[PDB]
Symmetry: C2
Subunit: 86 residues, 2 copies
């Protein structure tokens, strides 16, 4: 009962443009997608905007990664969050 | 292990930012990282409200934050984990 996630990081406008593209072409390939966010203030490991994308399964996550071109300005990291946070 | 302990706070977003400024101001040494307010977007989401995520160096650290910090009437919380490499 961990949910598969991908975090996308980058300049917010490019990140929101990438969010837009996902909602327009690749919507069947993820479950939820967040507003842009960042780690606060004096402690951040980075000062770049972040978008969280969640999946119904690992199969969906892998098919998203296969089908979608991720912009070279955008970086991405795979992980999990507890399912009950959703 | 490679799982970071977290607390996810929820509520009206002005309440959450007010609470967030309080955490940063008085309770900084009681947690690791804290997000800006965010929500699930897209025609898709589950809930209706904004969210702030707080990360910890351990479960004992999170335990002590929760006995120390007074959570405003307007704010709900859940405990969870996320991958450490996402931080």
């Amino acid at each position: 009962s961990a949910t598969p996630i991908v975090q996308f990081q980058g300049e917010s406008n490019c990140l929101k443009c990438f969010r837009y593209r996902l909602n327009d072409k690749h919507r069947h390939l993820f479950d939820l997608i967040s507003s842009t966010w960042h780690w606060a203030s004096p402690k951040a490991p980075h000062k770049h905007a972040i978008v969280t994308v969640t999946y119904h399964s690992e199969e969906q996550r892998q098919q998203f990664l296969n089908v979608v071109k991720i912009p070279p300005t955008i970086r991405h990291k795979l992980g999990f969050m507890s399912m009950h946070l959703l």
